[PDB]
Amino acid sequence: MRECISIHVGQAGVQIGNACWELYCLEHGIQPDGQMPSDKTIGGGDDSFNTFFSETGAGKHVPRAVFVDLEPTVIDEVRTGTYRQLFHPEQLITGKEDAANNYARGHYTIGKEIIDLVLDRIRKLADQCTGLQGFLVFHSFGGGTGSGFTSLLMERLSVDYGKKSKLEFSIYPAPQVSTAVVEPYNSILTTHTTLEHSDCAFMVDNEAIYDICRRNLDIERPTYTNLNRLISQIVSSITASLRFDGALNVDLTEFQTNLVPYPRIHFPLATYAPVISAEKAYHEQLSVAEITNACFEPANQMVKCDPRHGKYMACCLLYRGDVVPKDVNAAIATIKTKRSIQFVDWCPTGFKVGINYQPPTVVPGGDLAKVQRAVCMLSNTTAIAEAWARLDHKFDLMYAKRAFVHWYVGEGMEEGEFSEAREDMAALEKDYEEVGVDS
Amino acid sequence: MEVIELNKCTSGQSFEVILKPPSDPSLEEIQKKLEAAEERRKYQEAELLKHLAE
Amino acid sequence: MYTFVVRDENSSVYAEVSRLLLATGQWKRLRKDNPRFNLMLGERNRLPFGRLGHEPGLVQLVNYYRGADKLCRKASLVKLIKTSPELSESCTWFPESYVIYPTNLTDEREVFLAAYNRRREGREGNVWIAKSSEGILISSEASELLDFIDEQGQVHVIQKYLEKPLLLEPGHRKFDIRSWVLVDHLYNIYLYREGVLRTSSEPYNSANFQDKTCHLTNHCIQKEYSKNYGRYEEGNEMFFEEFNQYLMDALNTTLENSILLQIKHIIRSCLMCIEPAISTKHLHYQSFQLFGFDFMVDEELKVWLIEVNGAPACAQKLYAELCQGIVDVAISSVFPLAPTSIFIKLHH
Amino acid sequence: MREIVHIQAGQCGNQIGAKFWEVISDEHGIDPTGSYHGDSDLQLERINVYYNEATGNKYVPRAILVDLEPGTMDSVRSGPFGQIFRPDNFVFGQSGAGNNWAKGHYTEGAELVDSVLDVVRKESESCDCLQGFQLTHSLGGGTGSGMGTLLISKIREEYPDRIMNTFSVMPSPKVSDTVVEPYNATLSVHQLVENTDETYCIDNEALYDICFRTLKLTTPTYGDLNHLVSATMSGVTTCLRFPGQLNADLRKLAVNMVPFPRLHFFMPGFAPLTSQYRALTVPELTQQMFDSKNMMAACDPRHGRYLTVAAIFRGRMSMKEVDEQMLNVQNKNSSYFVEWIPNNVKTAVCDIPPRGLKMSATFIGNSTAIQELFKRISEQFTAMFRRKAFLHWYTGEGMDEMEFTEAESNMNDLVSEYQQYQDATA
Ligand SMILES: C=C1C[C@H](C)C[C@@H]2CC=C[C@@H](C/C=C\C(=O)O[C@H]([C@@H](O)/C=C/[C@@H]3CC(C)=CCO3)C[C@@H]3O[C@H]3[C@@H](O)C1)O2
Ligand SMILES: Nc1nc2c(ncn2[C@@H]2O[C@H](COP(=O)(O)OP(=O)(O)OP(=O)(O)O)[C@@H](O)[C@H]2O)c(=O)[nH]1
Ligand SMILES: Nc1ncnc2c1ncn2[C@@H]1O[C@H](COP(=O)(O)OP(=O)(O)CP(=O)(O)O)[C@@H](O)[C@H]1O
Ligand SMILES: Nc1nc2c(ncn2[C@@H]2O[C@H](COP(=O)(O)OP(=O)(O)O)[C@@H](O)[C@H]2O)c(=O)[nH]1
């Protein structure tokens, strides 16, 4: 058994982290007070769940997680919330004043003052690990902490643990729920600096999740709670293989080897189905064929973009619930002769498939209906570069006038880092065009 | 379609179906970056305090 | 008030579409880079499809289908037709074609040569034509065909030349048929009821392929190289009413029976083939597009598809009617303003 | 990221300031004696931003009151909520400033500034985490204008990394006390351009016009003008005072609102204008708040473009309708929003409405049309300065003409800078 440490940085990373651990506890039968009746080996074990939960002599099951935010508002919700008893105070780290949506403020100014305290709390967790495999880092692109502090944290993690894998769950910015006009700057700055330090990153566009919540959950104006409960379902299906018995994606290294043939091109598209509202009493259960077909619908993707006009490098299907290999191969047969699924020449056309018999757990009283089967597809498609193009365009519009640049320079950042980050993204866009476009 | 690497346990199954064959900065360098930014912050503030002093 | 932007200055079709929208009193034109638009009239090259449909509170629409280039690129059209089970073999309306690659800056040839040899020692006409997306060679010898593709340095297609075209009388003159097709956001396929024949002003020859004025029916070429241009009809352009009369008088049939039935069938086959790949039915933005289909008619009254144009111009006489049609069918359908249709619906 | 320290200086500054505190005290359920008597926890969650906790669990405004004579402050102290202010926080002289910037900034003011700074320091040092300061004052007199800007300079020197925020009342010949107002205003704008992060431009000409040809007041008094200012201030500080995730602290607001450091002068607006019975619909709030008639700076937004806009909707209403209407206002007037700052309009919603209203909306715009205001002042300044009229009042206090020339040059540069970005295109 190899342990995984989750790190939650800034408001988005913390609130999402809080939704995931809630869900993890429901899935493993852990109660708010930390106890697990199902667990028999008291005070320790080598079970699959132990990858995410350590144990105390008193039989408390404790998340291998640290929460970091530059202001205490959000993390204090955790300390006093439903799962207060789950975490230890050492895990929750708060600062005095936040990064004010300024990458440079979070990275340079405030980052410098708190980074050693953070790395040390992480070390305490690493020290209880017999065989740590690496880190899962949750954060927004757009916030000053989420963007600036995370990239410093990632740089230092590569130093203190150079062998370990690092995976990201990043919230890509959408104006519909956005809190700052400079988010594009923060996104490109953080992506540039983080790039070489992340083995695999799952981007979730708030726009996609927002719209899914509106059209499928009939939520008129989604809140962060609605968004986060949906995000945590997707996150759980992605991490479920590290927490449960199985043979696909059982260690963090597997994500890279299965999904990322070229190191920079490490942003797989997540697609999820089915999302059904818990308010619809009569609903007909979707089949393996149908939920699988839904994986090739832009309306269900974590980022809106069109894979028909890109090429695939890898594809993974993660099913939870009443699914057998026969139904999957049948679904894939029909779908293939019906849809535009072009793989790059230097990769095999195929799917790695995982099935977990426990159907998705939903939060009691949440917006999500319980369903008997669900799937999350992780596909590495060049079509996701559409999200980089949008982002880079917005950056260009503002940067051409040097709008808001002084806020960054004023925090000790050099202006050239803007052009440096933007050059890196331009190369990135070019790399995607090379692997995915003919002429 | 060929199904391979089929693995079964009580929790579930995994396998692979093929449809067609194919055809870092040191600790020192980072602290230097943080320190150089802090120095620029110190310099900008000293200029402000100089201006105010005049 | 609906808003829109303009990003192709050379489009005569949309230059008129814009002026129509302004005239409505319910459409306002914006600056090129203002993303706050309902309607984009895009550029022909490298249109930023990835930037469409991410503007909260705006339904957005563009006048191009992403992916339609597969149909509108000569090399691509041949590949699409050979490899698509829907078309491919058992397509009898596209001339035998091959994609040939120059030896300078997969690949065909040889396979082409094998078919060529068949008619060589087969007592059959082996006149072929080389072309790509001025710059066309009509020859009956394979040797001087390839020995022309490499001199140009661009992907080319060599297809069978139609040696037995239907010739208009008097004049013994070739021609081609242009049809305009509008595909709306719902993927309804609309054939404009008015077509045009682009005629040659020179009698058709069979031994002089050097004189490419009675062999190439391009209106651009005809004015430049023909003494009699405009002699038989204005601008070397015959419209459907006249052509129909001709067919009745000369051949005892109608345009609809002898030709249009086939034209409709071909348009449907091509567009339904590519539909799954380009449909914007469940996309975050929607598109429509106007296509230019060009056909040849042989002497047996068999219709052959020659090429599909993705950014077609129109015929002066017709600009007005068609453009209003685009507005009514393609644009006002999505953004309704506060018949006797000019289109025929090819029912997908 | 928490406590704000409020300073109010001079007659205008103290009169609007008293009203401000009167209004927010009511909204937060705090009585003239500083005792909380509300019926919600939303009104205490961020109460510490503007109030200190005292003995007996009562609330004291983190407010410092300043003047060079004692009159207006005596009136404040004997006012309705006069008892709520910390007695040690009244700092005043006896000489007055005679509507003279030089007196407030260089002579009479210099004498008193250190005692004000002592009070500022005592309030700061009590702060868990001071975010910054907000100053209320006019630019047309002597104390608020001259001493006010002197204080800002000294505060920056001592707290150079805190946000400095002002509500600055601009003078109007329509509502004038003396002919030297343009001199005092121009000298102050020079200071404000360099030393504040956010300045809310409250134009007495706008407040007058609104009272006259919207509220139908034949003869507006300073009281009527201040009713509008009270409401605007309560409105613009809402996101600071109640739970929310958008522009919830001074620095975050500044990062979202200010794309270039000198261009930090905001045009406020609100709806509905009151001096009732039927609540406004969300679409009405939106139409009205963006109407030039609802603006507190006398500049026509149609004469320029918005760099950035912040809006705040108050009351119980549909967040969906709010988003829709706000999107509608931008989509149907996209010409007036610069296209090179994408998504430059942000919106917050707070459940708690203001006194006497079911629904309201407050607008804060960074528009290049604000150049009209500075141009108006510049013109009045030059009309007198070309003939050195009334200059002796200033040279008598040791100032020389060169300082006027420099303040005038700097304000005209400010105008030309706005024109640049008004003309700028993607
Ligand atoms: C109803 C409208 C015009 C259209 C129908 C509404 C459209 C959508 C939503 C709101 C309004 C804008 C709000 C007020 C308004 O237009 O007031 C006008 C005048 O003051 C123009 C102000 C403009 C508004 C904007 C957005 C930028 C520049 O200033 C003054 C006009 O009396 C107001 C009324 O006519 C406004 O624009
Ligand atoms: N999906 C989701 N997005 C969030 C959440 N909280 C914030 N965001 C998004 O994150 C971006 C803002 O960054 P934050 O995480 O709030 O900021 P931060 O990391 O705490 O950094 P600072 O506050 O500037 O110090 C915006 O795009 C928000 O829409 C959340 O709970 N869920
Ligand atoms: N296979 C064939 N058999 C007989 N004639 C052919 C032919 N292929 C092409 N042509 C004839 O000559 C000209 C080539 O025109 P083609 O349509 O292929 O390219 P083009 O560059 O003219 C664009 P457009 O389709 O808009 O005319 C044909 O239009 C028609 O005149
Ligand atoms: N809105 C408003 N403006 C005022 C008030 N009192 C004075 N003014 C304006 O402020 C300027 C005079 O400055 P004032 O504050 O009286 O002088 P100070 O005491 O030296 O700061 C003039 O432009 C007046 O129109 C007031 O109560 N409300």
Ligand SMILES: [Ca+2]
């Ligand atoms: Ca155990």
Ligand SMILES: [Ca+2]
């Ligand atoms: Ca004295």
Ligand SMILES: [Ca+2]
């Ligand atoms: Ca002292």
Ligand SMILES: [Mg+2]
């Ligand atoms: Mg935060």
Ligand SMILES: [Mg+2]
């Ligand atoms: Mg062509």
Ligand SMILES: [Mg+2]
């Ligand atoms: Mg006075």
